[PDB]
Structure formats: structure tokens, C-alpha cells
């Protein structure tokens, strides 16, 4: 039999991300000899981006390709299924945690409880911030109306004095154009350029060379399927889909990075100034971030289990010291 | 029909690498519904490790899973299909170069001329060095009889004054034991421990925290199949094997990294001391390395094509400056 799944992505039509997503649907068809076809839908075509979770749960959408931390408000563990401020910051570290340190199994158990099947993470990129005004040091975040993807990312910036707001990436351009917000994080350079942020914001704010991305160094996406639909798919096809997603994870990653290399010269051409924060600004964010990591970990049994193993890993590779964990518990 | 392929790996029996490789053949069987069965063979079981290239070319072996730079002496481009001293040093950078910047197509074209189908790279790990006597700085390399995997890696150490020797990892232990060599690089901590290096060498030599691996930060493996055997495989199975290898690339990478985390405590227990070189030491190696990059790049049309796009990429991410390239050119 042939199966057809309808999957909407967080990528807006007309972005490098959507183009990569379109090709993935062709690859799935090739890998399953046409037995499984995925019909792609750009952000907002079936439902709003943040409404994808419920639509996939009901089966109205067969699956979704979101940025995983979008569900942080309803599933605490998802704040730990994508990068959070100053924690693990390399694609290979997240890949290791998910694929050998138990991360994938935590995600699958948590999503199964929601009637969803978490297939696996899709590698992507770090994120940058676009601002209408110069933010040159930690203290300049005070009073900035900043769009961020909620969750722990928003909490960290709020602890730095920013007024945070949650908006889908597609609403950032009009918000900055009208001055409804002063700044916005979204994704990396290439897609932000596709969305025109450079024309409504003259600055790009990044961390120092040592920590380019303070908040989201590894902004993971994923594929999540309605559990019933997943369980109805023949096992051989389920296994091929898992392989297709893991292969795509890196094909997506590479395509985004190539587009990013091409985008930087364009920002310079557009007259956009890239502001680099300092190592000291990062330390100020670090002191705010660690206690917040623990508060989020303490939300439910899944966030605790995921952070516990991530913390152990961070200790093993020198990303956290016992001294800085003083007074914190788990 | 059902296809059966014998594929030998550079991993010795009894290593974490070989266990991961055995699992991959089961994964291939599952992904192809039993149509493609790869019978795994540990290093030296069918042919010698360095004989795999000719064994596969002539068909004695259907395919191989080697460390790609083993063929540097016969195919100059392979010295650029795996990490080399002080160039790109993160797994994600090599993934990007191969999958979006044209790297994969260069490898495939170069191998096709040899009657081989290069499937894709297999991520792995950085490498560390084990020594019988301490090597605490750049100058301590003079006079050291050092085992390395030849090619550009051997040439950089020779430039530092070491007497290099080429040996399969499975022959490092006896070579150290009987004093044939003073030190040896091979792979990461877990597998080196599997091979018992800690029993014949009390030191591990690594770069500073900023540059843990000076010579081989991304020691890639790959799958290469006899071209005729590849062409006789139905296209649907060719595509599934390609996806399987790419998925495995990271499953392998993650498994190796987990094992590495578990190995450090065993080295401490075995009484092995980890010596870290300095940033100054890295600079001394750097001044030798860069000119060597160009020497190897100019070897043939493929080594030139590969290095050309890698240099362009490194320039793009600030890994090299025009200043330090003064007087060097393709
Ligand atoms: Zn973001
Ligand atoms: Zn090596």
C-alpha cells in the first residue's frame, strides 16, 4: 500500500529552509520507493506555527517540522531538546547527547505521552539577533522589546532586563517595520535575510568570537508524527523514515550553512553593522542562566531527566564547574 | 534478488569501533528488507588494512570502511578527505564542506577513476597521541620515532623533527612494547584503550584546551564500494545504502564519543598522565603546517580542487588570514 502524510514546517515559503524541506519530501519518496509520500506545507498554510502541536495531535496534520523549543510552555522537556543559553553549543555535542547519551529516548517517551511520535532532531544553525538600536553591552538589553521564541530563551533575556515577546518568524518583519518591537532573534543570517530583517533593522547583535551565540547556538528542528499515524505505518517504512530524517538533519544543516556564508557579505553591502558583545557580557549572562537552567529542569520528570544527563555531559567536557553550581540542586 | 557484500573495516575486533560497525550491517539489512546483506570483517581478517584499497579495486572485497587518508600516498586528494593539521577542526565543518560545498562530488569523481564508489564520509573523533616518555612541548618532538598514518599528517610531524613510521593501529602495541617506536598516534581515547596502549605507554600527549588535536581533529572514515558491484546494485538499494551510511556516520560518531567519556577514568586508573601542549606549541606547528597544505594541494587536479574550496571556506569562517598566506598560492 502507499501512504501519504501531510506535514507542515516552521519554515515560511520562500526561505532557504522551505526549499530544503521541499527536497526532503522528494528524498522520502525515493527512499521508500514511493510507498510513503510527504506533502509539504509552508508555515501557516494549514494552521499557525504554534498551533501545529494540537493539529498533529488530532491528526488534522499527520506531522510537523518545528523548532522543538516552541513547545516549552506545554512540555517543559522541549526547552532541553534544543539549545539553551550557554550550555552545550556545538552540533556534534547535541548529536552525541541525543544519539548515544539517552536524549532521543527521553524525547520519545515524553512525546508518546502527548500522543505524538518524536522521530529525531534536525540539525540547523546558531541564531543571531537583529536590532533597530545599538546593543553594545550586557546593560543595553535593559528596556529592549525583544522577540524571542519564549521558554527558557525568553526567561534569560528577561532576567537581563528585556521585555520579551513571542511572535512567529513571519511576523517579525512587520513588527520591526512598525517599531512594535526594537529587536528580534529568529534564526541564522541567510533565512533572516530571506525575511528582510536587514531592511527594518540596521544592527546585528552577536556574542564575542568565543561565544558567537549566547542564547541559541544549536537551534534544533525535528520531525514529530501523530502517534496513531506512526503506529499505522509498516515497520519497514517507519525505519526508513527514521533514516531519512537523520540523513536530512545534516543535509538541512549543510544547506543552511552554505546559504549563511553567502549571506554575510550581503549584510555588509546593505550597511548593517554587526555588533560583537564581549567575554564579560557573556559572563553576566552566564550568572543569570545557570539558576534558570535548574528552575526549568525542576518543572517535570522529563526536563529533570534530560537536564541531569546534559549536566553530567557538560561536567565531563568542562562546560560547567562545581563551583558555579553552588547552592543549586537536582 | 538478494545481494551479499563482504566489507572489511579498519577497526580491529575487540574495539568499540568494530562493535558499532557490526551493528551497522544489521541496520542495513533492516533498511533494505534483507535485500542487501553486508558481512562484516574486522581489520586484517581478509586482507591487511592498507591492502583494502586494492582488495576492493580488484573485487576480492566488495567494499571497505577505512580511514580515508590511508590512500594519501596513491591518491593525493584523500589527504584532503579527512582532517589535516590545523585546518577545519569541527565535525560540522567537514559535514558542510562535503554535503553543500562540493566536497562529496570531488571525492566521487576521484574514486571513480580508480574503479571505486566513494559512498560518503563517516564522522568519528579527534585523535590523541600515546608516548613512553613525556613530550611537553614542540621541541620534544625532535628525534621521536612516531607512528602516524602517513601522508600530510606524517609530513607535519617530520617537519617538527620526528622520525615517522606507518603502521596499522593493531601493530602499535607491540611496536611500543619492544621499543620500535617511542610514541604513537592512532585514534581517540576509548579505542586506544581497547588496544591496550595504556599498558605500554604512561603518557597521552594532547594539544591545549583551545586546540585539543593539532594533527587530526576530524579523523573521518568512509564506505567505498567496488564500482562494478555498486553499478550492479538496483538504484533503490544504492540510495538506501547511501542514506544508511549517512545515518551511521553520526550513530558511529556518537557511540565513539560516549565510549571516550568512559575511557578517561580508566586512563587515570591505569596511571596514565595526560600532558597538554601550549598555544605557543600550536603556533609553531601552524607555521610548518600551512606551507605543507599547499605542497600537497598542488599534487594533482583533485587535491587542488578540494583544497581550493576548503581554503575558500576557511577564509569565510576566519580560520586563515591573507597575512599568514603571504607567499603561498595555488
Ligand atoms: Zn531563535
Ligand atoms: Zn590518527
XYZ file of C-alpha atoms and ligand atoms in Angstrom:
662
model
C 0.000 0.000 0.000
C 1.055 3.614 -0.418
C 0.808 6.117 2.425
C 0.559 9.905 2.165
C 1.437 12.202 5.068
C 0.695 15.927 5.291
C 3.492 17.729 7.153
C 3.763 21.457 7.824
C 7.114 23.086 8.631
C 8.046 26.114 10.750
C 9.881 27.469 7.652
C 7.996 30.112 5.677
C 7.592 29.574 1.939
C 10.318 31.499 0.157
C 13.105 30.730 2.615
C 16.158 28.507 2.109
C 14.696 26.358 4.862
C 11.471 25.692 2.943
C 13.452 24.803 -0.208
C 15.438 22.225 1.777
C 12.180 20.892 3.269
C 10.649 20.504 -0.197
C 13.611 18.369 -1.315
C 13.303 16.211 1.809
C 9.791 15.183 0.726
C 11.228 14.024 -2.643
C 14.012 12.130 -0.851
C 11.494 10.253 1.387
C 9.584 9.170 -1.712
C 12.825 7.910 -3.300
C 13.956 6.055 -0.134
C 10.639 4.206 0.262
C 10.155 3.515 -3.479
C 7.051 5.667 -3.469
C 5.368 3.810 -0.603
C 5.446 6.891 1.609
C 4.909 10.365 0.240
C 5.096 13.537 2.294
C 3.118 16.545 1.062
C 4.909 19.681 2.298
C 3.092 22.725 3.693
C 4.843 26.039 4.423
C 4.441 27.832 7.753
C 0.872 28.920 8.330
C -0.774 27.129 5.376
C -2.801 24.640 7.419
C -2.546 26.232 10.872
C -0.473 28.886 12.619
C 3.021 27.708 13.513
C 2.355 27.462 17.261
C -0.885 25.629 16.529
C 0.919 22.763 14.775
C 1.264 20.723 18.018
C -2.519 20.370 18.551
C -3.233 19.865 14.862
C -0.750 16.968 14.739
C -2.180 15.543 17.983
C -5.674 15.427 16.471
C -4.413 14.034 13.215
C -5.585 17.003 11.131
C -1.873 17.269 10.198
C -0.029 13.958 10.011
C 3.197 15.524 11.193
C 5.225 18.681 11.727
C 8.770 20.017 11.315
C 9.008 22.706 14.050
C 11.781 24.245 16.082
C 11.423 21.925 19.074
C 11.581 24.503 21.869
C 8.319 26.045 20.596
C 6.507 23.638 22.906
C 8.425 24.724 26.033
C 5.302 26.227 27.575
C 3.359 22.949 27.424
C 6.180 20.340 27.528
C 8.983 21.586 29.822
C 11.372 18.991 28.396
C 11.346 20.614 24.946
C 13.358 23.560 26.354
C 16.100 20.933 26.741
C 15.576 19.292 23.347
C 17.076 22.386 21.648
C 19.947 24.611 22.789
C 19.500 26.927 25.760
C 21.753 29.800 26.855
C 25.439 28.978 27.389
C 25.038 25.211 27.620
C 26.189 22.663 25.008
C 26.953 24.727 21.907
C 28.172 22.579 19.052
C 26.106 20.485 16.633
C 28.248 17.417 17.444
C 27.530 17.763 21.185
C 23.772 17.706 20.702
C 24.132 14.840 18.236
C 26.132 12.915 20.831
C 23.664 13.608 23.645
C 20.679 12.518 21.550
C 22.240 9.522 19.875
C 24.410 7.877 22.498
C 23.715 9.535 25.834
C 19.988 8.776 26.020
C 18.471 12.027 24.750
C 16.427 10.520 21.920
C 14.733 8.046 24.291
C 13.741 10.835 26.691
C 12.173 12.786 23.835
C 10.302 9.740 22.572
C 8.865 8.865 25.964
C 7.774 12.465 26.650
C 6.090 12.905 23.251
C 4.425 9.494 23.342
C 2.520 10.737 26.416
C 1.147 13.539 24.233
C 0.051 11.100 21.527
C 2.990 12.055 19.275
C 5.981 10.233 17.857
C 9.226 12.234 18.027
C 11.309 10.870 15.110
C 14.574 12.694 15.718
C 16.299 16.113 15.769
C 17.101 18.024 12.574
C 20.389 19.979 12.814
C 20.176 23.571 11.760
C 22.252 26.568 12.873
C 23.017 29.060 15.621
C 20.762 32.162 15.782
C 21.558 35.874 15.550
C 19.695 38.987 16.726
C 18.610 41.976 14.621
C 18.152 45.320 16.358
C 16.893 48.790 15.411
C 19.190 50.257 18.049
C 22.793 49.502 19.026
C 23.069 46.978 21.829
C 26.792 47.039 22.608
C 26.983 45.585 26.103
C 25.005 43.491 28.566
C 23.397 46.556 30.175
C 21.983 47.710 26.832
C 19.410 44.891 26.917
C 17.513 46.731 29.650
C 14.263 48.069 28.247
C 14.637 46.398 24.807
C 11.354 44.977 23.464
C 12.770 41.752 22.088
C 11.077 38.993 20.129
C 12.409 35.552 21.114
C 10.929 32.009 20.956
C 9.657 32.071 24.556
C 10.570 29.358 27.006
C 13.946 29.456 28.694
C 15.386 31.667 25.930
C 12.858 34.396 26.782
C 13.407 33.937 30.500
C 17.151 34.516 30.195
C 16.698 37.755 28.235
C 14.009 38.908 30.673
C 16.473 38.359 33.521
C 18.749 40.768 31.616
C 16.047 43.448 31.657
C 14.483 42.919 28.235
C 10.704 42.953 27.637
C 10.223 39.750 25.681
C 7.522 38.894 23.207
C 6.697 35.758 21.269
C 5.914 36.023 17.554
C 6.283 33.545 14.672
C 9.261 34.407 12.422
C 6.889 35.561 9.692
C 5.576 38.394 11.894
C 8.982 39.783 12.835
C 9.492 41.935 9.709
C 6.229 43.880 10.058
C 6.758 44.234 13.827
C 10.212 45.789 13.356
C 8.996 47.912 10.411
C 6.266 49.424 12.596
C 8.519 49.683 15.638
C 6.263 47.406 17.679
C 9.481 45.680 18.840
C 13.028 47.047 19.000
C 14.850 43.843 18.268
C 14.454 40.214 17.358
C 16.201 36.920 17.404
C 14.939 34.388 14.859
C 17.328 32.063 13.112
C 20.648 32.430 11.298
C 21.831 35.031 8.766
C 20.557 33.550 5.495
C 16.929 32.961 6.369
C 16.692 36.194 8.361
C 17.870 37.855 5.125
C 15.214 35.993 3.077
C 12.710 37.532 5.515
C 14.181 41.003 5.037
C 15.233 41.819 8.612
C 18.189 43.866 7.314
C 15.830 46.402 5.759
C 13.980 47.136 9.009
C 16.873 46.773 11.472
C 20.334 48.270 10.943
C 22.258 46.221 13.512
C 23.007 42.578 14.121
C 23.954 41.714 17.730
C 26.158 38.650 18.318
C 28.261 37.282 21.142
C 32.105 37.532 21.090
C 34.211 35.302 18.753
C 34.462 32.766 21.587
C 30.678 32.574 22.079
C 29.023 33.845 18.827
C 25.609 32.695 20.019
C 24.785 33.323 23.651
C 21.151 32.140 23.571
C 20.656 29.626 20.773
C 23.897 28.096 19.443
C 22.166 24.912 18.228
C 18.595 25.724 17.216
C 17.243 22.250 16.555
C 14.189 21.403 14.482
C 12.658 17.905 14.439
C 10.032 15.700 12.817
C 7.096 14.720 15.034
C 4.335 12.450 13.732
C 0.766 11.838 15.026
C 1.266 8.633 17.116
C -1.675 6.764 15.626
C -0.490 7.517 12.088
C 3.012 6.442 13.125
C 1.766 3.172 14.558
C -0.269 2.516 11.385
C 2.836 2.731 9.171
C 4.516 -0.658 8.403
C 7.687 -1.103 10.433
C 9.967 -1.240 7.378
C 8.668 2.167 6.321
C 8.945 3.530 9.879
C 12.622 2.543 9.913
C 13.286 4.092 6.509
C 11.602 7.318 7.603
C 13.819 7.489 10.708
C 16.880 7.064 8.470
C 15.540 9.669 6.008
C 15.143 12.208 8.804
C 18.618 11.558 10.208
C 20.180 11.954 6.763
C 18.107 15.113 6.164
C 19.190 16.505 9.514
C 22.684 17.022 8.126
C 21.670 17.792 4.538
C 19.491 20.555 6.048
C 22.366 21.697 8.274
C 24.837 21.884 5.376
C 22.405 23.691 3.072
C 21.743 26.326 5.738
C 25.480 26.835 6.400
C 26.232 27.289 2.688
C 23.455 29.905 2.456
C 24.841 31.642 5.589
C 28.343 32.010 4.044
C 26.669 33.737 1.100
C 24.545 35.993 3.306
C 27.220 37.729 5.409
C 28.681 39.776 2.532
C 25.121 40.897 1.710
C 24.561 42.315 5.206
C 27.775 44.353 4.850
C 26.568 45.535 1.434
C 23.244 46.548 2.985
C 25.026 48.770 5.506
C 24.211 46.576 8.503
C 26.656 46.773 11.406
C 27.445 43.532 13.195
C 27.994 44.361 16.853
C 30.019 41.891 18.945
C 29.398 41.647 22.689
C 32.363 40.889 24.958
C 33.504 37.933 27.045
C 32.404 39.871 30.128
C 28.893 40.319 28.696
C 28.771 36.540 28.294
C 29.776 36.027 31.951
C 26.946 38.294 33.069
C 24.503 36.209 31.034
C 26.107 33.022 32.444
C 25.417 34.009 36.048
C 21.729 34.521 35.169
C 21.448 31.419 33.002
C 22.606 28.594 35.247
C 19.987 29.058 38.008
C 17.320 29.322 35.299
C 18.577 26.047 33.775
C 17.839 24.415 37.140
C 14.445 26.045 37.599
C 13.384 24.694 34.192
C 14.868 21.265 34.893
C 12.715 21.139 38.018
C 9.451 21.593 36.090
C 8.633 17.947 35.447
C 10.119 14.452 35.418
C 11.264 14.739 31.802
C 13.015 18.133 31.996
C 14.776 16.839 35.112
C 15.928 13.642 33.438
C 17.089 15.470 30.309
C 18.956 18.209 32.171
C 20.525 15.715 34.562
C 22.196 13.834 31.722
C 23.110 17.033 29.875
C 24.670 18.426 33.050
C 26.688 15.232 33.605
C 27.868 15.547 29.982
C 28.748 19.222 30.427
C 30.800 18.329 33.528
C 32.569 15.613 31.555
C 33.737 18.031 28.865
C 34.456 21.020 31.076
C 31.372 23.119 30.282
C 30.375 23.611 33.916
C 32.322 23.642 37.167
C 31.149 22.514 40.610
C 31.932 25.991 41.948
C 29.300 27.609 39.732
C 26.699 25.061 40.801
C 26.955 26.075 44.465
C 23.553 26.179 46.119
C 21.810 24.550 43.155
C 20.297 21.053 43.360
C 18.687 18.271 41.357
C 17.323 -10.914 -5.833
C 19.423 -10.673 -2.673
C 22.872 -9.080 -2.568
C 25.686 -10.098 -0.237
C 28.799 -7.927 0.230
C 31.926 -8.602 2.270
C 33.135 -5.328 3.798
C 36.210 -5.051 5.976
C 36.730 -2.120 8.352
C 39.914 -0.511 9.681
C 38.508 -1.247 13.164
C 40.143 -4.179 14.957
C 37.973 -6.864 16.557
C 37.518 -6.091 20.226
C 37.169 -2.321 19.751
C 34.128 -0.039 20.219
C 34.551 0.832 16.563
C 34.117 -2.765 15.423
C 31.038 -3.244 17.641
C 29.427 -0.156 16.050
C 30.344 -1.417 12.545
C 28.759 -4.827 13.251
C 25.535 -3.059 14.286
C 25.565 -1.052 11.039
C 25.370 -4.243 8.963
C 22.249 -5.216 10.898
C 20.835 -1.760 10.259
C 21.487 -2.157 6.504
C 19.667 -5.485 6.493
C 16.697 -3.843 8.252
C 16.642 -0.818 5.919
C 16.667 -2.954 2.769
C 14.281 -5.632 3.987
C 17.085 -8.176 3.722
C 17.902 -7.460 0.085
C 21.385 -6.143 0.902
C 23.424 -8.053 3.435
C 26.839 -6.776 4.374
C 29.001 -9.419 6.070
C 31.359 -7.527 8.405
C 35.071 -8.309 8.754
C 37.419 -6.791 11.372
C 40.821 -5.339 10.387
C 43.191 -7.952 8.962
C 40.582 -10.720 8.760
C 40.522 -10.886 4.967
C 43.372 -8.616 3.851
C 45.781 -6.266 5.574
C 44.403 -2.853 6.476
C 46.470 -0.982 3.900
C 45.657 -3.667 1.312
C 41.951 -2.856 1.443
C 42.180 -0.325 -1.381
C 43.492 -2.881 -3.889
C 41.356 -5.645 -2.429
C 38.212 -3.634 -3.185
C 39.504 -2.343 -6.542
C 40.072 -5.920 -7.727
C 36.881 -7.265 -6.147
C 38.400 -9.590 -3.529
C 36.390 -7.398 -1.151
C 33.092 -5.809 -2.191
C 33.757 -2.739 -0.041
C 35.760 -1.189 2.781
C 35.315 1.147 5.778
C 38.801 2.704 6.161
C 40.248 5.939 7.458
C 40.151 7.825 4.153
C 43.602 9.413 4.358
C 45.238 5.948 4.273
C 45.330 6.349 0.494
C 47.240 9.650 0.566
C 50.338 8.090 -0.964
C 48.417 6.915 -4.032
C 45.533 9.423 -4.232
C 46.725 12.867 -3.023
C 43.122 14.102 -2.713
C 42.446 11.661 0.151
C 44.774 13.727 2.364
C 42.040 16.371 1.937
C 39.115 13.978 2.572
C 39.980 13.772 6.256
C 41.355 16.396 8.634
C 44.900 17.698 8.369
C 46.938 19.739 10.834
C 45.308 22.987 11.950
C 42.702 23.253 9.187
C 38.933 22.731 9.622
C 38.541 21.079 13.033
C 34.877 20.558 13.826
C 32.705 17.658 12.614
C 30.024 20.107 11.420
C 32.566 21.939 9.232
C 33.571 18.762 7.412
C 29.897 17.817 7.085
C 29.173 21.206 5.499
C 32.170 21.017 3.145
C 31.188 17.531 1.932
C 27.461 17.993 1.704
C 26.903 21.567 0.472
C 30.250 22.995 -0.661
C 31.027 20.347 -3.283
C 33.281 18.011 -1.346
C 31.299 14.841 -1.944
C 31.357 15.245 -5.745
C 35.147 15.700 -5.816
C 35.656 12.515 -3.793
C 33.290 10.549 -6.002
C 34.959 11.743 -9.209
C 38.447 10.964 -7.883
C 37.469 7.489 -6.664
C 35.550 6.654 -9.871
C 38.834 6.988 -11.787
C 40.117 4.179 -9.547
C 37.122 1.906 -10.161
C 35.684 2.704 -6.723
C 32.424 4.230 -5.494
C 33.003 6.581 -2.556
C 29.635 6.485 -0.720
C 30.221 9.193 1.860
C 32.243 10.163 4.957
C 31.699 8.591 8.360
C 32.180 11.020 11.247
C 34.339 9.670 14.032
C 36.506 11.584 16.508
C 39.676 13.571 17.031
C 42.889 11.551 17.685
C 45.292 11.537 20.639
C 48.946 10.503 20.970
C 50.419 7.985 23.448
C 54.099 8.171 24.442
C 56.553 6.146 26.543
C 58.436 9.299 27.501
C 56.933 12.696 28.145
C 56.582 15.178 25.273
C 55.791 18.503 26.978
C 56.436 20.982 24.207
C 57.061 21.456 20.489
C 60.809 20.918 20.801
C 60.347 17.494 22.476
C 59.178 16.063 19.137
C 62.718 16.170 17.725
C 64.126 12.664 17.495
C 60.901 10.947 18.494
C 60.161 7.794 16.472
C 56.461 8.436 15.936
C 53.780 6.246 14.400
C 51.251 8.252 12.361
C 49.003 7.478 9.347
C 51.452 8.865 6.796
C 50.520 11.422 4.193
C 50.240 15.040 5.278
C 49.986 14.076 8.947
C 53.379 12.358 8.834
C 54.916 15.233 6.925
C 53.925 17.845 9.537
C 55.493 15.825 12.347
C 58.603 15.140 10.275
C 58.902 18.916 9.823
C 58.813 19.174 13.619
C 61.758 16.765 13.747
C 60.092 13.422 14.399
C 61.059 10.185 12.637
C 57.720 8.969 11.378
C 56.630 5.407 10.701
C 53.483 3.956 9.135
C 51.847 1.053 10.968
C 48.269 -0.264 11.313
C 46.807 0.622 14.711
C 46.850 -3.083 15.537
C 50.653 -3.081 15.438
C 51.217 -0.052 17.668
C 51.124 -2.029 20.918
C 53.944 -4.447 20.053
C 55.951 -1.643 18.404
C 55.857 0.375 21.634
C 56.442 -2.709 23.805
C 59.677 -3.696 22.057
C 60.958 -0.146 21.602
C 60.487 0.011 17.841
C 58.748 3.372 18.418
C 58.706 5.975 21.222
C 55.175 7.234 20.674
C 52.138 6.779 18.511
C 49.018 8.478 17.334
C 46.057 6.340 16.299
C 42.518 7.391 17.223
C 40.639 8.639 20.290
C 40.852 7.538 23.954
C 38.316 4.659 24.055
C 39.612 2.561 21.148
C 43.248 3.286 22.002
C 42.405 1.861 25.433
C 40.656 -1.125 23.799
C 44.006 -1.793 22.053
C 45.850 -1.554 25.383
C 48.053 1.472 24.732
C 47.887 2.340 28.437
C 49.762 -0.869 29.230
C 52.795 0.062 27.160
C 52.818 3.877 27.392
C 52.361 6.006 30.519
C 51.640 9.280 28.744
C 48.989 10.734 26.460
C 50.030 13.870 24.571
C 47.301 16.363 23.534
C 47.114 19.947 22.363
C 45.958 22.817 24.595
C 42.264 23.186 25.543
C 41.824 25.566 22.603
C 43.293 23.062 20.100
C 42.917 19.548 21.611
C 44.042 17.919 18.402
C 46.752 19.589 16.368
C 47.133 16.930 13.705
C 43.818 15.087 13.363
C 40.743 16.845 14.848
C 38.269 15.166 12.447
C 39.553 11.678 11.568
C 36.993 10.592 9.007
C 36.206 7.099 7.868
C 34.048 6.342 4.826
C 32.461 3.499 2.888
C 33.922 2.778 -0.553
C 32.485 0.043 -2.740
C 33.913 -1.755 -5.783
C 32.461 0.251 -8.694
C 31.124 -2.765 -10.619
C 29.487 -4.257 -7.565
C 27.968 -0.812 -6.954
C 26.686 -0.461 -10.518
C 25.093 -3.910 -10.341
C 23.040 -2.829 -7.321
C 19.483 -1.608 -8.168
C 19.242 2.178 -7.821
C 16.670 1.978 -4.950
C 19.131 -0.065 -2.872
C 22.017 2.251 -3.858
C 20.021 5.179 -2.479
C 19.088 3.323 0.694
C 22.728 2.350 1.287
C 23.725 5.997 0.826
C 21.152 7.090 3.440
C 22.220 4.208 5.719
C 25.878 5.255 5.630
C 24.994 8.886 6.331
C 22.773 7.905 9.292
C 25.527 5.569 10.522
C 28.099 8.341 10.193
C 26.568 10.042 13.199
C 25.447 6.927 15.105
C 29.099 5.872 14.871
C 30.300 9.327 15.901
C 28.024 9.382 18.963
C 28.950 5.865 20.078
C 32.651 6.699 19.888
C 32.129 9.901 21.912
C 30.187 8.092 24.665
C 32.942 5.470 24.916
C 35.524 8.299 25.083
C 33.808 9.874 28.107
C 34.002 6.482 29.815
C 37.691 5.990 28.909
C 39.291 8.933 30.707
C 38.587 7.475 34.176
C 40.209 4.220 33.024
C 43.383 6.012 31.967
C 43.514 7.725 35.374
C 43.139 4.303 36.996
C 45.852 2.831 34.756
C 48.204 5.561 35.992
C 48.462 7.388 32.678
C 49.247 11.099 32.740
C 47.683 13.432 30.195
C 50.125 16.113 29.074
C 48.738 19.196 27.330
C 50.815 21.198 24.868
C 50.535 25.009 24.696
C 49.114 27.645 22.399
C 52.682 28.632 21.513
C 53.353 24.989 20.556
C 50.280 25.107 18.282
C 51.637 28.253 16.594
C 54.955 26.546 15.927
C 53.117 23.643 14.272
C 50.947 26.135 12.373
C 53.904 27.812 10.668
C 55.014 24.375 9.400
C 51.522 23.118 8.545
C 50.189 25.801 6.204
C 53.017 25.585 3.674
C 52.588 21.804 3.740
C 48.880 22.254 2.902
C 49.840 23.889 -0.383
C 52.584 21.359 -1.150
C 50.000 18.573 -1.018
C 47.273 20.650 -2.673
C 49.402 21.120 -5.775
C 49.858 17.373 -6.251
C 47.082 16.764 -8.808
C 43.832 18.170 -10.148
C 41.731 16.668 -7.352
C 43.937 17.675 -4.434
C 43.891 21.167 -5.934
C 40.105 21.277 -6.391
C 39.459 20.041 -2.837
C 41.924 22.353 -1.131
C 40.724 25.302 -3.195
C 37.165 25.130 -1.836
C 38.391 24.239 1.676
C 40.686 27.283 1.707
C 37.821 29.489 0.496
C 35.684 28.055 3.310
C 38.370 28.576 5.963
C 38.755 32.173 4.778
C 34.994 32.574 5.146
C 34.944 31.441 8.780
C 38.188 33.138 9.855
C 40.359 30.013 10.058
C 43.175 31.523 7.982
C 44.267 35.087 7.157
C 45.685 36.515 3.934
C 48.636 37.628 6.040
C 49.708 34.121 7.008
C 49.151 33.034 3.399
C 51.742 35.574 2.206
C 53.896 33.959 -0.464
C 51.706 30.839 -0.753
C 49.380 30.249 -3.679
C 47.592 27.782 -5.944
Zn 15.839 31.799 17.580
Zn 45.369 9.077 13.742
